[PDB]
Symmetry: C3
Subunit: 108 residues, 3 copies
């Protein structure tokens, strides 16, 4: 069975591998980042955690995609296998000739 | 066909089961939460809605995973079924013996 | 193979079709939107980008869903095809009659 990543942040009690998101609180210092690409500061904090979740969802979609591509290829192989369908169910015996079922009695 | 959950929040006119996200507006009071795990306050508001969407995406990925696991098991069953491939198409009749196609004429 | 959309915003160096998310920075003017449904303003900015990503994930899940629905239908068709399983492997020849394998020798 398919193993996916759990979301790293939750708005509620966390399970293994998870942390509880920290929403912006009244009373805490309201801050942003001090570099051009940093993500620190309370104003960014919960949004960063939501993005961490989004990155994991993207990876999980990729895991499903790979498995589905394999399923699609496996299906195509089965479709191309040339498996033979049932013969008539009419109390008569059949043999295989030129991609069809032919009565055994025509040869006896 | 597979039934997934619609995203509960949209940045545009909503359809059934959806609400329009409320971005932070100039003039409104800029607030956070008053408890350690609450998510209230304008500073959190749109981020909370985006997280609601993320939670639904996670569930939808799970629905696809379950369906794909069933597909994978169904494919494995077909692969293990021992279905028989076509016989030669050469104007001759064939019968089945020891997992192969053998000429009927060898028995007559 | 299945073609999905790349996420438009990343917290790191972008690849083709991507932009680097701009987190809220100390020193920049802290602003929201000036209309009831606009998303402008630094306070909304990274959250908007995360939502853009969420919208793309939703679309990608839909692409997988369509492909998986086709796989499921293709599997059902194979299951309903009436393909014939192997005959006994016992050194004897078999012919097909009434949905079963019957010994050729019973007809000779």
């Amino acid at each position: 069975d398919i193993v996916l990543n759990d979301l790293p942040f939750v708005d509620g009690p966390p399970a293994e591998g998870q942390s509880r998101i920290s929403w912006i609180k009244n009373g805490e210092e309201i801050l942003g980042a001090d570099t051009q690409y940093g993500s620190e500061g309370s104003m960014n904090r919960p949004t960063v955690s939501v993005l961490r979740n989004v990155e994991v969802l993207d990876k999980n979609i990729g895991i499903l995609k790979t498995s589905l591509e394999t399923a699609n290829s496996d299906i195509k192989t089965i479709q191309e296998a040339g498996y033979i369908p049932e013969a008539p169910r009419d109390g008569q015996a059949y043999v295989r000739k030129d991609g069809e079922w032919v009565l055994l009695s025509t040869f006896l």
